[PDB]
Amino acid sequence: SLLEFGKMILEETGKLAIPSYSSYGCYCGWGGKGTPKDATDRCCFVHDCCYGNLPDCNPKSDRYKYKRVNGAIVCEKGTSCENRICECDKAAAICFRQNLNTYSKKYMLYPDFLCKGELKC
């Protein structure tokens, strides 16, 4: 759920998922086509692929729990779906944080028409 993931992002980046990453690049939004604009965008690309590999789940809606062990992110013992959804979000948020040094304001509110050609996971 955008809830737990939203909290992960705000904790790892110090930024609100809405709207710092909700309209970013070609993949940190909704759909997604074309070449990711940068590392942060690639993060969302990989994030989509991760969700894409959970056909048996509801990555976006379904919810889960999680905690933090003296610094790092720690996914709790839930249903595999919730355990994996958690790992997909943890990797993206840490990916975001990792690449904060290249986060670009110009990639926010990115018009999708500028995103062409479906890249493969």
Side-chain angles (χ1 to χ4, degrees):
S1 175
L2 273 199
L3 191 174
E4 303 81 4
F5 184 37
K7 168 178 282 185
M8 277 184 213
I9 300 177
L10 179 51
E11 303 181 317
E12 297 296 316
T13 68
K15 296 155 74 166
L16 289 60
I18 298 284
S20 300
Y21 291 100
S22 60
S23 64
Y24 200 104
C26 290
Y27 292 91
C28 305
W30 185 101
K33 312 120 62 183
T35 310
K37 316 313 301 188
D38 62 348
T40 288
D41 199 19
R42 283 192 282 289
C43 292
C44 297
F45 171 67
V46 166
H47 188 243
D48 282 340
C49 295
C50 200
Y51 275 7
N53 286 77
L54 308 181
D56 55 342
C57 313
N58 287 178
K60 295 181 181 178
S61 66
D62 185 61
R63 249 199 341 123
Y64 62 77
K65 289 289 182 177
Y66 87 82
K67 273 262 56 188
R68 4 186 70 270
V69 167
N70 304 309
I73 295 292
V74 169
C75 287
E76 186 183 301
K77 341 280 287 177
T79 73
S80 264
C81 267
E82 307 175 314
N83 301 309
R84 284 173 283 146
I85 293 174
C86 180
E87 286 303 336
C88 286
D89 297 342
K90 164 181 174 177
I94 287 186
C95 187
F96 288 156
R97 176 172 70 62
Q98 288 168 52
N99 296 289
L100 269 172
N101 50 296
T102 53
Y103 180 90
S104 189
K105 303 296 172 183
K106 56 160 177 159
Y107 284 149
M108 284 179 268
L109 309 174
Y110 203 72
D112 198 57
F113 84 90
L114 285 176
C115 304
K116 330 159 188 185
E118 291 288 54
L119 134 64
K120 299 140 295 298
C121 284

